[PDB]
Amino acid sequence: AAKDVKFGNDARVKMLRGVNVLADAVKVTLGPKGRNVVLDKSFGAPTITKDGVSVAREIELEDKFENMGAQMVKEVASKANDAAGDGTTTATVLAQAIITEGLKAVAAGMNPMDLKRGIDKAVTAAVEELKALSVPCSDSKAIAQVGTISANSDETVGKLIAEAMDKVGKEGVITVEDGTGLQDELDVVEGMQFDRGYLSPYFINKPETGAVELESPFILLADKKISNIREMLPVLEAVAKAGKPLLIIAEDVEGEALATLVVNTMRGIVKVAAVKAPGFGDRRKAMLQDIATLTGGTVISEEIGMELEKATLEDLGQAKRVVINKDTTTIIDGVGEEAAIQGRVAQIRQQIEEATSDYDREKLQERVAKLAGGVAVIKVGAATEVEMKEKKARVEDALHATRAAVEEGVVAGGGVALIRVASKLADLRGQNEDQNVGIKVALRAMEAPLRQIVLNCGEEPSVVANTVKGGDGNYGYNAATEEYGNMIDMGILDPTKVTRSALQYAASVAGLMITTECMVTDL
Amino acid sequence: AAKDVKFGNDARVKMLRGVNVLADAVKVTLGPKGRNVVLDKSFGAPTITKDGVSVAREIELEDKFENMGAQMVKEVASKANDAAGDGTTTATVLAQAIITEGLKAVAAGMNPMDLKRGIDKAVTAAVEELKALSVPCSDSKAIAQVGTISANSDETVGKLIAEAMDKVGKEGVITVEDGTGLQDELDVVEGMQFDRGYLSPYFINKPETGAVELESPFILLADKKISNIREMLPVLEAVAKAGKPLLIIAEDVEGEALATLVVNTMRGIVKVAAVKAPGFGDRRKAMLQDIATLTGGTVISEEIGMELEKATLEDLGQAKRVVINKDTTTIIDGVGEEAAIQGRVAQIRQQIEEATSDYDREKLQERVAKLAGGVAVIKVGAATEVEMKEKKARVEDALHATRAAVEEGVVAGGGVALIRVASKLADLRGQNEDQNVGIKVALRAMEAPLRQIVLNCGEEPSVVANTVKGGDGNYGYNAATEEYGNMIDMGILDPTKVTRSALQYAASVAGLMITTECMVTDL
Amino acid sequence: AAKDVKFGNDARVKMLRGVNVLADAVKVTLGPKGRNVVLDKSFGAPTITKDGVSVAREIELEDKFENMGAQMVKEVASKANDAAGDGTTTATVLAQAIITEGLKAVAAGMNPMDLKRGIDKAVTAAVEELKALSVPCSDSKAIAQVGTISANSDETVGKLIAEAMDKVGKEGVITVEDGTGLQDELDVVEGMQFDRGYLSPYFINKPETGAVELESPFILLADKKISNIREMLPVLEAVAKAGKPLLIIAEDVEGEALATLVVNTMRGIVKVAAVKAPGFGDRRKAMLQDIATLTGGTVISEEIGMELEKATLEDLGQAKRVVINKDTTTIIDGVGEEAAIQGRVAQIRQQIEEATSDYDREKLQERVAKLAGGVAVIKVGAATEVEMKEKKARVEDALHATRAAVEEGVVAGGGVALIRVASKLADLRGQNEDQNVGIKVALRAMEAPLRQIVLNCGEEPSVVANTVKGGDGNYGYNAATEEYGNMIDMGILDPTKVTRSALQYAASVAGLMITTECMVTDLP
Numbered sequence A, B: 001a002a003k004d005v006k007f008g009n010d011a012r013v014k015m016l017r018g019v020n021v022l023a024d025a026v027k028v029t030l031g032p033k034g035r036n037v038v039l040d041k042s043f044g045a046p047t048i049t050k051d052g053v054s055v056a057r058e059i060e061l062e063d064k065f066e067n068m069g070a071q072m073v074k075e076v077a078s079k080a081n082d083a084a085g086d087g088t089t090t091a092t093v094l095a096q097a098i099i100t101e102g103l104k105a106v107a108a109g110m111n112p113m114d115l116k117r118g119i120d121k122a123v124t125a126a127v128e129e130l131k132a133l134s135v136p137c138s139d140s141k142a143i144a145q146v147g148t149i150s151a152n153s154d155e156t157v158g159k160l161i162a163e164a165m166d167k168v169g170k171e172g173v174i175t176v177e178d179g180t181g182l183q184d185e186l187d188v189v190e191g192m193q194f195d196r197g198y199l200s201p202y203f204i205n206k207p208e209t210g211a212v213e214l215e216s217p218f219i220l221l222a223d224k225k226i227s228n229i230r231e232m233l234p235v236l237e238a239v240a241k242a243g244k245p246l247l248i249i250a251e252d253v254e255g256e257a258l259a260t261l262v263v264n265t266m267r268g269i270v271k272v273a274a275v276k277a278p279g280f281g282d283r284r285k286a287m288l289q290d291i292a293t294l295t296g297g298t299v300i301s302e303e304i305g306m307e308l309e310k311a312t313l314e315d316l317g318q319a320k321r322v323v324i325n326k327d328t329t330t331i332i333d334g335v336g337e338e339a340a341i342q343g344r345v346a347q348i349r350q351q352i353e354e355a356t357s358d359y360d361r362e363k364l365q366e367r368v369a370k371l372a373g374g375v376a377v378i379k380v381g382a383a384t385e386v387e388m389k390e391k392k393a394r395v396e397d398a399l400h401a402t403r404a405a406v407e408e409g410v411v412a413g414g415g416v417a418l419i420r421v422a423s424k425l426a427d428l429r430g431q432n433e434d435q436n437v438g439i440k441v442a443l444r445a446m447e448a449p450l451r452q453i454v455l456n457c458g459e460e461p462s463v464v465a466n467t468v469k470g471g472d473g474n475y476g477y478n479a480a481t482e483e484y485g486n487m488i489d490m491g492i493l494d495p496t497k498v499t500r501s502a503l504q505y506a507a508s509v510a511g512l513m514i515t516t517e518c519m520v521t522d523l
Numbered sequence C: 001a002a003k004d005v006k007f008g009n010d011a012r013v014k015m016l017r018g019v020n021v022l023a024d025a026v027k028v029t030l031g032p033k034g035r036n037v038v039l040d041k042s043f044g045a046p047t048i049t050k051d052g053v054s055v056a057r058e059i060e061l062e063d064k065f066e067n068m069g070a071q072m073v074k075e076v077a078s079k080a081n082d083a084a085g086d087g088t089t090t091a092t093v094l095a096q097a098i099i100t101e102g103l104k105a106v107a108a109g110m111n112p113m114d115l116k117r118g119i120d121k122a123v124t125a126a127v128e129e130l131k132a133l134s135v136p137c138s139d140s141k142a143i144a145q146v147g148t149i150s151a152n153s154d155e156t157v158g159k160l161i162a163e164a165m166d167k168v169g170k171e172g173v174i175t176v177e178d179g180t181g182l183q184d185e186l187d188v189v190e191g192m193q194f195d196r197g198y199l200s201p202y203f204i205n206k207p208e209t210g211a212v213e214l215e216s217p218f219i220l221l222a223d224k225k226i227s228n229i230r231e232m233l234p235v236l237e238a239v240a241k242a243g244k245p246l247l248i249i250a251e252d253v254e255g256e257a258l259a260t261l262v263v264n265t266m267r268g269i270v271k272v273a274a275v276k277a278p279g280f281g282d283r284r285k286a287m288l289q290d291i292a293t294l295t296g297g298t299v300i301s302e303e304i305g306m307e308l309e310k311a312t313l314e315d316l317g318q319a320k321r322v323v324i325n326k327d328t329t330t331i332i333d334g335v336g337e338e339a340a341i342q343g344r345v346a347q348i349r350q351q352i353e354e355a356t357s358d359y360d361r362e363k364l365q366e367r368v369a370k371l372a373g374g375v376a377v378i379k380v381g382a383a384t385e386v387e388m389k390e391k392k393a394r395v396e397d398a399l400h401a402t403r404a405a406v407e408e409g410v411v412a413g414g415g416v417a418l419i420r421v422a423s424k425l426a427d428l429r430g431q432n433e434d435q436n437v438g439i440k441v442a443l444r445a446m447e448a449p450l451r452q453i454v455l456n457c458g459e460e461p462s463v464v465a466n467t468v469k470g471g472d473g474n475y476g477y478n479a480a481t482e483e484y485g486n487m488i489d490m491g492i493l494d495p496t497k498v499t500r501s502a503l504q505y506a507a508s509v510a511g512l513m514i515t516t517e518c519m520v521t522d523l524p
């Protein structure tokens, strides 16, 4: 259509106004004194959330240039959520600060590309300093504190994550689901976790989390791909009124041959799900047999010769609950037979003892680790559905932050890590003066998380930032208690992955955004 | 779409204005001197009701932020209705009071998260005090009093509930349905009650109660799930014009295929219903056989060898009336054969005797308990349909109240319980001053039910509140007579569950709502 | 006409919005790094100014309730201008801070009347602490520093005002007017220089200068107007016998008398020059008497009783030297008793004390400066008229501040005095908790000028305020150099009267505004 084309400072101030609207909506949520944002839903009741990426995703503006700025900055929060599941508000605050100071530098007349290069150099150096400053979670051993900080000073959630990880291992899968009582319940049940996703995005249910879930789903297993529709049409037709959603696990379902005609078939009564089988060959066949034994089902194979037309409901397996995500699909609880599960575990352990190859040994040890850990389920207790959603979001943030902490380490919370690495980069220089100004923009913007936390506390951000900068190491400011101290000792820990990801994504988007001279959008 | 984003006090006052509109509409109904609200209905005549959740559900506002506040507070009334089926108005009044005082505290500058934590701590302590204050409701007079109070001081409804529970047992099922006559009739007929719900929400009939009902539904029983459409197509085609809505009870029913093509089949002339069979295995087969004997039908099974096609209209059973709800499905009256039902009761009882296992004995005695109790049907007598709906609402409320009363006990009515619990929590303190202010907000809001009752009486809520606070124990104010006295002696009893639920849901939603700094909604 | 009525939080929010509009327009000028505000004028070019009172005067809002708030807070700047002539921006900033904190307190449910009482108590204690903290400003160096600070760090203005005050003295009068040149000029005239020229051009003794120069002349002071030579004829004959020149001050000399005086002027019998008396009714007689006292003469009037035919040489006044030009008359070293001059000056001082009008008081002080001391005129030099107006406003501010400094002393500038006073009042308490909160909001508002100055420099107000509070005595933050030091040593001095007046007026107005619960105004 006809285009509105804006240039220079007019385009940049419109972009900054949209950035500021999104970033203020997100930034009111930052920190332990951060407040909740109500997001209206046409679906049902409004969602009350402290989660910055949710707020950012809901933001969309009427002015088209402001809307472009808001969408571009919204990418920062969405990328932080996708990468680490936490620190999305910190990432948005960093992005807004970089954008504001970089646009001020552009107004001062510095070359925006050189400003972007300076920002990128400063952020690379800051990522290196964050890696150097990071204390591994094994040495610190403060998983409960990380979960508490991520769950907004909810010590119960932090202790729940700590118990779940001490029970199912630091790498075992943990799933957050809606409970039924007022209290949070930890349930270490038998389950399986594999890193695969759905073939099509049309299997997404009414919830907007992007992960499909099934109530007591059916289990169908196959290593050899089927040849015609009539061979599996009886299995789908059988599950037709079997109140257990047919979860098909095979190599790679063609959406045109299942999803299209099934969508023409059902209007949404039940969500037939198809997922990819990870691995290949004999490893995939062994995993399929293990999953069938877990769920009580059987695997169809050409060598065996047993056919889907001969398959019945009793032959196939089942799982109490299954959650399928693009990143990783988890089976929460499969009944099967406990004695059969234990016998299969013993057989796989004997296979480990018999095998001597490194690849076979490591894959079989991954198998036994998955079977031993099972699935930890955290039931979220809440009186109402809006409290349920808020608390579940906070528990998801705590789980993501604890996972990131065990993956990469911890640093001082409350923006102190960024303050410290900015102080160590005070001597960083670029190839020219505009690159040096970009470096200084990045270093000043690294203060923005702490200052926004202090503003949300209603305290004086400049005074607290000065006091923290005058300190050293993990010295910082406890916003929950409004006093200074060693942040590690007070338990205010941030995952190094979360801080690094927030800084990197905010830097990339904001550095690109400060280089924009022209904006083209619909009238 | 483009979003209207409001912050701070503007967002909070819009939210409070919407809360106030919904809460005033609901609160005019509170107490004995509460008045009726007319809810316009597009389908037909307006409904006149004194129920609070109905009014709250109908409230929806033009201003989008006020609408956000109204929907969030409406969740309180809907949650209370779902939990105890009574106390929705009290819950709304509590939620509005907490919201108002918490927003005043936020304007005073207290940290809203700490206010929410104080409210939650006060409400937890208040739930403990409600359990301590509760007195077991184990008398027929007490049950009658609870029903009378819950039926807007209708002693006839209270006595009807008391007689129904003294006849079918304090746990036997009781169903409220319209009566042709102008008088309320108690009918203790044989019936079956099982805790299961419909597979799909597409079986909901015209009435908005969320429970489907069938006129003389046909009964079909199965423990083995079907494989193809053609096995049951003669049964569906038969009942098609047999004259009885086909109620299908099977192991694990599903509508994936059934619901879509059946909806494509009928346009709504008659309602085909499918429900899950509770339990599993031999227990489910025994229950299915019992239901088939009750309704005169037979249970198709692979072991039996019978098939749906083989079954004729005479072979299959029927029920005078069936009401299916998500929580619990009841068969009001399954004719069958009285001699058959008797003989089956004697057989099952002998099975209980013969049996020695604790699980077997318990389930067996539960079976005979259901058979003996049957269903107590209360026919609501009204001259007109609007009076029918109003009186049926009040009878439903009385039934839910009496149920909760026998389950969890009774406390002083007229908001006296909350007053007493607030007086006992006067010494409760939090971790900081904002938490203490939140505790005080909760304690002050616990007075709101009594004050609103007094306002509906047209009396002075402050004077009555102070007079009740000056007293102790079950001392309160009889609003029906405008005189003070012992609430228990005067018969003004509230179910402890109802009071606790109202308080908990109001607290959860209102504590979340007072923490909101930003609101995002469509323009 | 029909009225719009608003109550409680809504009315207070609209009032605060209007106050904030006015204060945001004004506070951008506070401090050395403060900027200029352009005020559109329906007539002439727009005015560029760095004065809070002008910006505040121009502010008027469309929203009626916001306009109410703006007008009320505009009273602060107007009153500060009226009393001290400086500090109007500091006063508007203080009023905005008090209003903001007090409205916050009202939103917390505290009684606004008690908040106002606490604010009043804190401000009274603050005025006492300012008086205690003030130091005299009598040296010319401190006066120059005060003028420089009040002129937006224009050392030339401060030094010029210091020189003017040193010349004219304590009783001297200094006025600021436009100058033709690009440079500021100081013109000081001593003794009597009343603005009346020769009644006849031919009286000019010195043609190359176009002025009459009389050496040791007699002075004739007649309160009446004359047109005939008969009545002064004995006086003229006596003067001619004496041989010294004569100067006539009278309501008017014209016709035959003037012509005869001129003819005798050329003929040389008597060196005579006649000029009009100064001023108008009720004042002209006072001027004549002042001149008689200076020159040791007597005024010839019909009210007093004496006639001019009976006037003698002893009746005539005496002066050392006289200069008549077309525009003004100058008398040098009038031969009159000193004690009489001091007595007449004391009577005029008593009239000043009795006077209740600005015009009357300035005219009486001008008369005093004519009798004793001197009168100075500062011609402001600027390249254009907009620059002329801006510089004239700054010079008038500097002059007002220097007069205030001489009257009541100086305190540390840069909002440091208010910071120290608020620190000294931390223990002050009221009758109840609401009064205590009012005291606290007044004390916190006392930090507003320093914070706004720092904000106008682009720095962090909170950090600088904390650093200044951590200091003691006159330690402060020089905004011009962005450095810390002794405000007195770096020459950042604020008149005690200016600071006290700003605090007092802002407190009174703001305290009344926070007490508002309803607003009544015309509908839109």
Ligand SMILES: Nc1ncnc2c1ncn2[C@@H]1O[C@H](COP(=O)(O)OP(=O)(O)OP(=O)(O)O)[C@@H](O)[C@H]1O
Binding pocket: A029, A030, A031, A032, A034, A050, A051, A052, A053, A085, A086, A087, A088, A089, A090, A091, A149, A150, A152, A153, A397, A412, A413, A414, A415, A449, A453, A477, A478, A479, A480, A481, A492, A493, A494
């Ligand atoms: N008590 C505390 N004192 C100081 N800083 C704290 C405290 N608790 C948490 N923080 C800091 O607050 C930040 C986390 O704030 P918040 O959880 O609101 O946002 P986020 O994690 O960046 O994003 P989001 O939760 O929206 O994904 C971290 O920098 C953390 O170290």
Ligand SMILES: Nc1ncnc2c1ncn2[C@@H]1O[C@H](COP(=O)(O)OP(=O)(O)OP(=O)(O)O)[C@@H](O)[C@H]1O
Binding pocket: B029, B030, B031, B032, B034, B050, B051, B052, B053, B085, B086, B087, B088, B089, B090, B091, B149, B150, B152, B153, B397, B412, B413, B414, B415, B449, B453, B477, B478, B479, B480, B481, B492, B493, B494
């Ligand atoms: N005669 C009475 N005197 C005093 N209080 C009474 C009397 N009758 C009932 N109440 C009180 O009135 C309250 C019940 O009010 P009401 O039945 O109007 O609404 P509700 O139970 O809160 O909600 P709903 O809309 O679900 O019916 C209880 O607290 C009960 O104790």
Ligand SMILES: Nc1ncnc2c1ncn2[C@@H]1O[C@H](COP(=O)(O)OP(=O)(O)OP(=O)(O)O)[C@@H](O)[C@H]1O
Binding pocket: C029, C030, C031, C032, C034, C050, C051, C052, C053, C085, C086, C087, C088, C089, C090, C091, C149, C150, C152, C153, C397, C412, C413, C414, C415, C449, C453, C477, C478, C479, C480, C481, C492, C493, C494
């Ligand atoms: N170099 C400086 N460093 C610090 N403070 C300074 C400096 N120069 C001036 N100030 C302070 O600026 C304040 C007044 O400056 P300004 O002329 O902007 O406002 P004002 O006198 O309050 O207003 P107005 O001239 O409109 O009546 C005083 O407190 C003075 O001490």
Ligand SMILES: [K+]
Binding pocket: A029, A030, A031, A034, A050, A051, A052, A089
């Ligand atoms: K957040």
Ligand SMILES: [K+]
Binding pocket: B029, B030, B031, B034, B050, B051, B052, B089
């Ligand atoms: K009611």
Ligand SMILES: [K+]
Binding pocket: C029, C030, C031, C034, C050, C051, C052, C089
């Ligand atoms: K100024």
Ligand SMILES: [Mg+2]
Binding pocket: A086, A087, A149, A150, A151, A397
């Ligand atoms: Mg977080």
Ligand SMILES: [Mg+2]
Binding pocket: B086, B087, B149, B150, B151, B397
């Ligand atoms: Mg009720």
Ligand SMILES: [Mg+2]
Binding pocket: C086, C087, C149, C150, C151, C397
């Ligand atoms: Mg000034």
